[PDB]
Structure formats: C-alpha cells, structure tokens
C-alpha cells in the first residue's frame, strides 16, 4: 500500500491531513478567552432521543486550573486527557506548584506525531485547552494531531468552525466580560447547530482564577439561553 | 517489471537496479580523486561555490579515519559521513583488540562488508556515495575506491563524480609517463591540476580546491590537510596548466 509516515508532493503528511478531515465531521466546540476568564462550550449532538444526553462528556477537567473541550473522534481523546491529567499532577509532585497551560498543551502535543510502523495512526480529534496561570494569565490553546498548537483569543473547531470563526472575528474584543462571553458562545453555537439549541443538547463551562474549572449545570445554562433570547428580541 | 522498486531484488538480468540507481546519485555529485605516490597517497576534491555567502575553507569535505587514513567521497554527502562514522568505529575496535592501527586493506574490507550489507535487505537503502580512501601502513601506501554495491579494488589512481572521465584520462597519463613512480609533492601538484581540468564538467559555478595527503617522508605516515603556501603553490601550478 503506502507508508503511514509518508510525505505528499506538497510537503504534508498524508495521515495528518486525513485526520483533519475527520475533525471537520465532529460536533462543534467553541472557546473564548477574556480577562475575567475563559469560556468553553460544546454541541452534544445526541444520535437518538433515548440517549441520556448528560452522559455525553465532551468538556473535561484536566486540573483545577485547566479545562478541555474536544471535537472529532472523541474516543481518541481519552488517552490524551489521561496523559494531560498525569502530566499536570506529576508536575505538582516534582515542583509543588501548578503547571503552566502552555507546558501542559506542549506535553499533549508531543504525543501527536508519535505514530508509525508507538501508535499506528494520528489522533482523529482536536482539543481546545483553556486555563489560567500566574505568569501568562487566562489562556486558550488549540491542539491539533499535527503536533502544532496555536494560542487564541477565541476559537471554534468542528463542523461549523469556519462559519463560527468568522462570527468570532467580528464579535471578540479585549474588554469582553465573562457574562458577555457566555452569551456569545451560546449565540454562535445556536447559529451553526442543526437542531434547536437548549440546555440538554449544548453544554457550557468556564475557568476562573477564584473558582477554577467548572462545568455549568443545565439549570444555569437554561437561564443564560433565556437571557440570550430576550436580548436578541430587544432590537 | 517492478524489480527496480525494491532493494535486494534480482532482476531477470541478475542485477540489483536499486544499487544502479544509487550510482546515478554518485555520478550527479562533485568530482573527487585519489593519487597513489611513492611513499603515500594524495586526496583532492571539487567544492562547488553555490554562493558568495559560503565561508571559504570552512565546509571541509575530506575526513580522517584514525590518524593514518583519509576518506573522500562523491554523491550524497550525509551517506558518506555515515560511512566514515562506521569506519571510525571499525578502526577503533580493531586497535582496541589488536593494538596496532588498522591496515588499509583490512579497513577497506570493513567498509566493503558494511556497504554490501545494505544491498541484502529491502528494509535499507544502498549508499549514495562512491568513496575514495587510503593511507600508509606497515606494508606501505594503499589507495582504494568503494562503490554503492560494496565493490572495491586497489588503485594507482582513482576518480569519481561528475568529472570522472576527464579525471581518469589525466590519471592514465601519469601512470604511463611515470612507471618508476611519483613523489608526494608532485602528486599534490598533479592532484590540483586534475581537479581544475575536471572542473570543465561543472563550469557554471566557480569552485574551491581542497587537498589532503598521507606520506611516510612528508607527514610521518599521518593524514594531514594541505594548507597555506603548499596549497597556494598547487593552485598556481594548476592555474598555469589550464592557460
């Protein structure tokens, strides 16, 4: 057939590029960074109404100061999360401190290109890693299966990504409040989702310095959805 | 067909096309030569100046093995370095066990067997270099040339690279006109000339001359680079002959 670690004539790794196509098929995940915190939100996308939607876990805690949202082949993310959690806790063991968000992201991305003929293929999932540390403050990273990671003020991944990213282009500014960011994620998720957005098929979360990483209750998100509807009807 | 897609596969001819394709990489490289003299050997190589930004005399191509063997090659430069690294390991283990420095024929086979081993499996690629090497041992001077196939012989004069035909012709004249032999200092001058004459095949870009030598009288049987006045004297002699 052909090698797994093969370069294309354009100078790209075939398998890495193909894994990026799998991520485009995944459910939407959005992240917005502010000076009051970083907000993470995801489309749950249940395949059937009998599926208990609260068991869909696409937003995940890595440490108290680091959260993580995923998009693509979500089964592949489990070993990445496991490594991230181990890395975070291990650094706390060796250095008696919290680990930098960038260092954590770098550790996750080091797994990415460990494939050949090590694991047999790249990961088919993208990660939005959001957190806070004392040095660089509130941060949001986009970790790809290429091993590359970019920092972002705001970022969308998944099926409605390019449409959402254009919307985030216009809406984001450096003075955004946390409440404003929450509504902004809900707004854009509602725009790109197939089914109608509610508290059961979409999930919010955030990371603040004080309270750390928190996944929002369905009752709490429901109010933010109702607050969104009213403010859009206001003009 | 398909016999040329995999290394270590015999074609219906009884040929290993992958090795023959490695030879093409060698033929694409710059010219390098070797000259056997009365009590030693001389090595010379053509270094193409791709740009003015290249620092003169810094990108050294000729490599020493142990303290008495010199190695030069044409083709894929990294492959040549890999081969010399192995040569240094082979020379070290020989001296470790047997005390005496490795003889040149002994050293030649060590490389030969290693290069030949890379024609036995499809999991490895053949070497993209022909290597001219040699020096002085207890039995005197020796010059060798080693191909991608693992084939090597002893030589009076040797040449490889893009200007090998021109070089070979010049070497053949020296063998005929000097049956009694050639001195070490003469061989350095002649080596410079031959590289300059062989440069007509790479005449687009200008080049830098690099020479080394092992001689029982001139260098005490140790490998040394030709530097300063002796190098300039060889360049002047070479420039005088082309005009």
């Amino acid at each position: 057939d052909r090698g797994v670690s093969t370069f294309s004539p354009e100078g790209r790794l075939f398998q890495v590029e193909y894994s990026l196509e799998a991520i485009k098929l995944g459910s939407t995940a959005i992240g917005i960074a502010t000076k009051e915190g970083v907000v993470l939100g995801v489309e749950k996308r249940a395949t059937s109404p009998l599926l208990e939607s609260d068991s869909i876990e696409k937003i995940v805690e890595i440490d108290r100061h680091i959260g993580c949202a995923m998009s693509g082949l979500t089964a592949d993310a489990r070993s990445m999360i496991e490594h991230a959690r181990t890395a975070a806790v291990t650094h706390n063991l060796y250095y008696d401190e919290d680990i930098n968000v960038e260092s954590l992201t770098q550790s996750v991305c080091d797994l990415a290109l460990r494939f050949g003929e090590l694991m047999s293929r790249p990961f088919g999932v993208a990660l939005l890693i959001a957190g806070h540390d004392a040095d660089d403050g509130y941060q949001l990273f986009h970790a790809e299966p290429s091993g590359t990671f970019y920092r972002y003020n705001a970022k969308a991944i998944g099926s409605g990504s390019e449409g959402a990213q254009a919307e985030l282009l216009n809406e984001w500014h450096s003075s955004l409040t946390l409440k404003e960011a929450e509504l902004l994620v809900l707004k854009i998720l509602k725009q790109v989702m197939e089914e109608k957005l509610d508290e059961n098929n979409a999930q919010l979360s955030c990371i603040t310095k004080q309270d750390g990483f928190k996944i929002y209750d369905n009752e709490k998100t429901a109010e933010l959805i109702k607050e969104l509807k009213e403010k859009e009807a206001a003009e | 067909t398909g016999y040329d897609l995999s290394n270590s596969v015999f074609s219906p001819d009884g040929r290993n096309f992958q090795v023959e394709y490695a030879v093409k990489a060698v033929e694409n490289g710059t010219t390098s030569i070797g000259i056997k003299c009365n009590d030693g050997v001389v090595f010379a190589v053509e270094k193409l100046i791709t740009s003015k930004l290249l620092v003169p005399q810094k990108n050294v191509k000729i490599q020493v093995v142990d303290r008495h063997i010199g190695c030069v090659y044409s083709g894929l430069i990294p492959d040549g370095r890999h081969l010399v690294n192995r040569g240094r390991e082979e020379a070290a283990s020989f001296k470790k066990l047997y005390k005496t420095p490795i003889p040149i024929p002994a050293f030649a086979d060590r490389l030969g067997q290693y290069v030949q081993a890379h024609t036995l499996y499809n999991s490895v690629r053949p070497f993209g270099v022909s290597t001219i090497f040699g020096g002085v041992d207890k039995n005197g001077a020796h010059l060798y040339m080693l191909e991608p196939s693992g084939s090597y012989w002893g030589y009076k004069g040797a040449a490889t690279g893009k200007g090998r035909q021109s070089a070979k012709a010049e070497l053949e004249k020296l063998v005929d006109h000097h049956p009694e032999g050639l001195s070490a200092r003469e061989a350095v001058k002649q080596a410079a000339k031959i590289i300059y004459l062989a440069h007509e095949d790479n005449k687009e870009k200008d080049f830098e001359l690099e020479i080394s030598w092992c001689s029982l009288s001139e260098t005490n049987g140790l490998h040394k680079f030709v530097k300063g006045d002796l190098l300039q004297e060889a360049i002047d002699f070479a420039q005088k002959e082309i005009n």
Binding site: G3 | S6, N122
Partner: protein
C-alpha cells in the same frame, strides 16, 4: 520494504466479514464429512477418510479421530497438520488443568481455550488462521455428555447432533429429520452411518473409508470409556446396521 508483500490476513471486508476465515471455511467444505451425535447414554463420532488407496495402512492410520484425554475426543475436518498443532495444545491444557485443580477438565473449558487460540489468529499476528473445524465429543460430571463444534473464526456452539466438512447442508437435514431426544447410542450409531452413506461422494461406503468412535457410560459402573473402533470392528458394525 516488506509491506509490499503483506496479504493482511486479519482485516474486515467492506461487508464486515473476515476474508481468511471465510476462505478457510471454503477449504474445510471440501474435507471429509465428520458427524457427531449425542444420545442419553453416550456419544457417537463418525467420519469419512478422503479417497484412500488399497496400499494405505489403515490399522495404524489416524486422520480424523483424535483422543484429547480419557473423557474427551475430537473429530477433525480440514488440514490434518494444522489440527495436530491444536490437538497437542489441547492435550497440554487438559493436563495443566488436572495438575492445578486435581480434577479432569470440564469439556466447555477445553473447547473455549482452543476456540480462543483460533480467535487470536483472526485478530492479531498477521498469520493465516488454522484451516480446521473440530467436533468435540466429551463427558464431565456437570453437564454430562456434550457435543461442541469450533471453526477457524474461533466461534463455538453446542449441539445434540452436528456435521462438519463436506455436504453438511444435506447431512444436517437428514440428522434433523431422524433425530429424537430419547435416542440411545446404538440408534445413534445407526443414524451416523446412514447419514454418511447418503451424503458420501463415493460410490459405496466401506470399512476402509471410515473412522468411528463412541464415548459410553457402557463401562463397568459409574465411569466413562472411549472406544476408537478398529478396521474389523467398523466392518462388523456396517454389516450389523445393514449397509454392506
């Protein structure tokens, strides 16, 4: 490199089938028919040797029926050499169990172990599967008399009566017709031979083209006896049942 020449023995087809397992089953379908029938007071194993010769030494020959231990035997259908590899593994497994627990291995446990080995060759290793189907006939004190079958997929199932190898479709129909639950060994012996006599590709069914075996509690008091039939004993049972 070497990838070029790899057949990839352990992959799914677009339809979700294992190529090599399916092709191995095709191989087994050309093998001599083997039949197993379970009765209330014992088990019968009958099997047809493939186009023999007059110069084959039959009394010292064994290609179909093998002994795993004193309580368990197998009928083979497929590559004999492949079967012997597995048979020796099963014999060892039975002895390991006996050494560990000081009790004879339950039939199902032995069957599961062999079937798990077969399964491994379909999921990893890059090797071809074993081209073998077994009929296991055995006894233990939990379930009593038992018949199982395993195939190259590593899947196994329990039976009252079953056939493997050639003409199983025809053979299974004939068994399904004449089999009853209150049946006895002597009746089951007759059924097995009659089924082979009708499904065989040969002109006539003779003693020299058959291997036969029974597992009976017909041993002096509460115990089990394995009987691998001799050529002369197969000749007699053929006359008794009225086939020759």
């Amino acid at each position: 490199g070497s990838r070029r020449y790899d057949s990839r023995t352990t992959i799914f087809s677009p339809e979700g089938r294992l190529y090599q397992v399916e092709y191995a089953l095709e191989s087994i379908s050309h093998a001599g028919t083997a039949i197993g029938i379970m009765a209330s007071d014992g088990i019968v194993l009958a099997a047809e040797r493939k186009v023999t010769s007059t110069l084959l030494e039959q009394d010292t020959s064994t290609e179909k029926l093998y002994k795993l231990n004193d309580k368990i035997a197998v009928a083979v259908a497929g590559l004999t050499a492949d079967a012997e590899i597995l048979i020796n593994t099963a014999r060892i497994h039975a002895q390991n169990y006996l050494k560990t627990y000081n009790e004879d291995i339950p039939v199902e446990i032995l069957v599961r172990r062999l079937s798990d080995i077969k399964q491994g060759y379909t999921q990893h290793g890059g090797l071809r599967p074993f081209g073998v189907s077994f009929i296991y006939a055995g006894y233990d004190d939990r379930y009593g008399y038992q018949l199982y079958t395993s195939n190259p997929s590593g899947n196994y199932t329990g039976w009252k009566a079953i056939s493997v190898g050639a003409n199983t479709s025809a053979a299974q129909t004939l068994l399904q017709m004449d089999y009853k639950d209150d049946m006895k060994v002597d009746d089951a012996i007759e059924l097995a031979l009659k089924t082979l006599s009708k499904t065989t590709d040969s002109s006539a069914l003779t003693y020299d083209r058959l291997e036969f075996a029974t597992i009976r509690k017909g041993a002096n008091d509460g115990e089990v006896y394995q009987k691998i039939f001799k050529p002369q004993e197969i000749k007699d049972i053929l006359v008794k049942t009225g086939i020759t």
